[PDB]
Amino acid sequence: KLQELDISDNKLTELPALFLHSFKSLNSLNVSRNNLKVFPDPWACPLKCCKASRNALECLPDKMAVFWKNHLKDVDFSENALKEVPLGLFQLDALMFLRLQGNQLAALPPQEKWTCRQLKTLDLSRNQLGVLEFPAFLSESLEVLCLNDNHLDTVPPSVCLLKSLSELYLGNNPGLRELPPELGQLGNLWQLDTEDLTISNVPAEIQKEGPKAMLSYLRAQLRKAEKCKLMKMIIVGPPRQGKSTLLEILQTGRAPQVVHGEATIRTTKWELQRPVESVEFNVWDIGGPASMATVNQCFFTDKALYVVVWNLALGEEAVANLQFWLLNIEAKAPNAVVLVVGTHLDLIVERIATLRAYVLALCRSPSGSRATGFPDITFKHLHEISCKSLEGQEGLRQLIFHVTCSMKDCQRLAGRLIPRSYLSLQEAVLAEQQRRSRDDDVQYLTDRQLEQLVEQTPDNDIKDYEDLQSAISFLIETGTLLHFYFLDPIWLSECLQRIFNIKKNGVIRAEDLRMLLVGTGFTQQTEEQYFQFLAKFEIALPVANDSYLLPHLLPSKPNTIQRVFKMSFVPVGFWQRFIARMLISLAEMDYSFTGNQRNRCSTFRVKRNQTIYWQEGLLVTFDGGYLSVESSDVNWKKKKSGGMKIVCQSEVRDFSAMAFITDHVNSLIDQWFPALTATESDGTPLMEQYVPCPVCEVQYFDMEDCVLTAIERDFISCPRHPDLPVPLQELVPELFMTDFPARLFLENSKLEHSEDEGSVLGQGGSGTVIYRARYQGQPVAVKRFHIDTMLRHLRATDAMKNFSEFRQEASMLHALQHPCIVALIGISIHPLCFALELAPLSSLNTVLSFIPLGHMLTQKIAYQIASGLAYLHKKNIIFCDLKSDNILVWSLDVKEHINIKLSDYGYDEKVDMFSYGMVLYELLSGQRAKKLSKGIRPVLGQPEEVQFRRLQALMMECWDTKPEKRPLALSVVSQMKDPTFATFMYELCCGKQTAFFSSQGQEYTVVFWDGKEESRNYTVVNTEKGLMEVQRMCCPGMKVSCQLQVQRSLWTATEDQKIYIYTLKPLNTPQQALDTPAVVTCFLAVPVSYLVLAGLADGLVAVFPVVRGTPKDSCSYLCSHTANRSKFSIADEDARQNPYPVKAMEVVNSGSEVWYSNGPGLLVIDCASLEICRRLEPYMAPSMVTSVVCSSEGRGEEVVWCLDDKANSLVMYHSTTYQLCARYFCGVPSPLRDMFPVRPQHLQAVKILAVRDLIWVPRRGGDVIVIGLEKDSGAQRGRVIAVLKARELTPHGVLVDAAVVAKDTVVCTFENENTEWCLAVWRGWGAREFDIFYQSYEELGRL
Ligand SMILES: Nc1nc2c(ncn2[C@@H]2O[C@H](COP(=O)(O)OP(=O)(O)O)[C@@H](O)[C@H]2O)c(=O)[nH]1
């Protein structure tokens, strides 16, 4: 009978196993920490775990899989005296964890006879086990395998098959000398113990790098990896500097006779032998007109040899121009090697040294180290040649070959091992490109087509995403494949140039552009692809009325704050891209959460009245202001350079417009012109920012100084008049927030703030720190942001970035006013921080058998989370991190309106819904991942155990694998606004059975009966657990027509007029058999030590006194017809005296009366004298009463309800006056929120139930009408509080019965035409629970 046995730290050598065998109820067997020598022989008991560690057990019996095969999962016999392992221990299906560590096991049983398909952890370390032979099936289950200090002379052959391992520990096996290549296939394995092992097949360097490098190298061995000598080389430089001439000299080795004509990109395959003894270059001669200067940069890739061609005789301006190219290469190809090669050497001795000094000054800072943002140029990377005499040609070739063999990833590029499958894919892609070129086909290759290529390739072992991605990176490195996948750079260049050759005001209608684009084929079936990459390069962007804006076709040139940006050099087409991006963003104007790099321009929301865009400027007239940006020529420190003059006029000091430009400028300079992010070799920025002095009126404040002062102070004094300071608000109104309402700003004098580690509540995704603080005495969460000429520049950049991020976060937080979203109290600049409302309790992950928080609280939490998500998605905001860490618990009180709030501190909508499903799993379970990407989901118990079928089903859908099937947050919110969602617990399929019975107890909660005569049997359902404790236990005898439970005795009245009594201790042997004059049709127990009344089929009532559950064989007979004739003067001919059976009885008036049916009438038995004293006429013949209940609950008058069979009518009397004070029709097709007064086939009701305060009327249709009484203007009335209907029971037939099995449970039992029975379990909500449920939605709607 015992469930948990804990024998530990005691005098245990011999265990009374026979005594333990009686414990059939055990779930945990713990005999650990003893000197146990004889483990008890296994027995039938549903053990979940078997802890027998730290004892003297030497051997086990072959009986684990005889009794515990289907129950026992956790076994740990570790650190014992074990010598032999039974075969049966591995024959347990339920086994998932096994520990046989620290003993004298020498061999394992044959693998063919194992059954433990669920074995996930197996530790055989510290043993003499040996080489061993593991089963194959363990590959699909095992996650942890450890064999440390085993009798192994090699890796077991089966370890290579164990694809599912995450840990593999085989240390201290000195006989092992090999790690076979197939272990590389263990892709899921990242924890390894190869200590004390010899590895002859792995280099020492690979071992030093680690077991991860070992697995990678073994994979390389398996894939027959070959040494590749192919690398990308790119010629770049200013136009007409001899790029084609230089390449011709390099390839031919002669004075050029044919130089290539006009072209943007040309390609060739150049082969060199040593002056791993050869190399091959996929040479891309990149040239073209000046208009391609900032488009060609897309073709620059990493781990490639760049040759910047430079005209030596042109002068110093050429060397200065080289900075542009060098910055571009270092920005796009950080790990590339750059050589600067000089031509026109025939036009020049010391001049060469001077020019080399100039170039070396460019690449290196004054300190001599590598300048930031430049490639590593040195004396080895410089060379000069001529175009006729070929001087230095051989030296140049030697330089190329030497640099190529020097570049390395781990070893040198020229000869690195690549998997053979990667080379096979390279051949396949080259074949595809060649075929498309032959067929004049679109050279753009779709991802599906590349997958088809890699799979279609013979014996290509690329079978997963990571392999294909690595192969893609390799292909990009060798100039075979291009991505921004493209196969032909020349075709792309031709397409872009042809678009550039088009000659409106920059906007062309989509159809006109489609016909114009016909030159490069432009297959309409590929148009969606084609236009896509047109948008990628910003060559033709979709705008307005399904038109396309063409930046190269922009027209020419047709109180306040001002800004200036000084540019040393203007990139070609910078203005076009800038104006196009601004114009498109404004046209859009007419997000994320929890911190990320993803965000939109939420900073600027105004009505654009007029817009004037042109080749080098944009003027925007918006309601209450102007925003203009123009080209200009700036002069500072007598340095004249290009410039961007920006002006804004705001009537209300709303200078958010100056953010809109500035952010965009930064964005553009970060995306397409990274050259302008960098500084010269001496630290001078290539693009500087300036603010004209408004009080000096030209004098310009350096924007870095204004920003750095804005961190702490408010004023700056100009050098021309230091005694007359200017506030920063007239210099940088962007940073000092002015657009926000005045109410939104915190008062530093009323804010108790301190960046104390003890008050740290957490961190955000943007790099902030959230502390606990006080504002005006109330607790709050304060999110604080945190931040030599080079150090000053870096700090200024960081400060500007933080101010922009603060602006964006404030803009998004200001727009969320939903009750379930953490609001914003206010902002402040000194210090730069947010103030937010603080949760009295910690996050949901911290407060958290099943449903730990309770049903109602879990329901409210889930609904409020869903409502918050629906609101966020209504604002086009995505949470992106919807974990329980970020979900703050406001209160665990069920009565409160708001319980949780969604925070940003501790894609599209489908990922949010997925994370919501995970949160629901945690809510139902109490706990809780790469396997999620593979279709593996966390496991939750069945509905019979969870007991919340609808939320569990919702959680399954939220965790679905196809995003298309997942629900929208609004749909979840809408379907949760329904009492069916909350009340239904689960369903239980009992199956084929005959009759249903219940009793006011828990020993015989729900009892079904089936069978006939010798085959009579019964089933018991434990609805509290959803488990059937007895299933068709046979108790031969007559079938039971009625059943009751009194004290601890079950009375059952059969069809042969016999009341049998079974005393519980199995209803096998009755103790009493009582005779009756007619078949019992109903039972009741009056609490008098009881008085059991039996309503017989003839309308007569039998009365049995009961003493402690045992009655007297004699009984009294109270005749209803006798009372009708004698007391109440009803004639025999009256229909009221027809032979009706007693259908339902009920106690009323605290046991002093019993109301029981008699045809359409009702009779009252007065318990004082056991006589029929009152009659009531709720209905008329031939109708009959079918149920009676006593709604004796609440601070009010006791009332008695009565249902009917024909009229389908409900009536209610007062128990103390017998006045028919209410009548209602229950056959209402749409009964929701109906009403009736009180005066002080599928629509047929089955049986009334009294659930706490309310009256549940189930109907054959399967739904339930939950009627309850209230008062209006002093008059009592009744209303239909809620109509429940579980859809899951639709195919389970018709409702037959219903019964209140416990205080908080209502069991409605359905039967189908095939004699099968099915229970539907509802939570027995009273009036207060329903009102709380409804108010949870009504109030949040109101708020
Ligand atoms: N004198 C001299 N002329 C050169 C040299 N390299 C190229 N050229 C001239 O440049 C022309 C070809 O330039 P090209 O290679 O097409 O420049 P790219 O378009 O940038 O590749 C030829 O007509 C040559 O006369 C050189 O080293 N010395």
Author numbering: 381 to 510, 539 to 683, 690 to 762, 768 to 828, 835 to 909, 920 to 938, 945 to 999, 1012 to 1043, ...
What does the paper say about this structure?
LRRK1 and LRRK2 have a similar domain organization: an N-terminal half containing Ankyrin (ANK) and Leucine Rich Repeats (LRR), and a catalytic C-terminal half containing the ROC–COR ROCO signature, followed by the kinase and a WD40 domain. Despite their shared domain architecture and involvement in intracellular trafficking, their disease associations are strikingly different: LRRK2 is involved in familial Parkinson’s disease while LRRK1 is linked to bone diseases.
Most particles classified as monomers, with a small subset forming dimers. The kinase domain of LRRK1 is in the open, or inactive, conformation with its DYG motif (a tripeptide involved in ATP binding) ‘out’. An unusual feature of LRRK1 is the length of its kinase’s αC helix: it is approximately four turns longer than is typical in kinases. The extra residues pack against the COR-B domain through an extensive hydrophobic interaction that is unique to LRRK1.
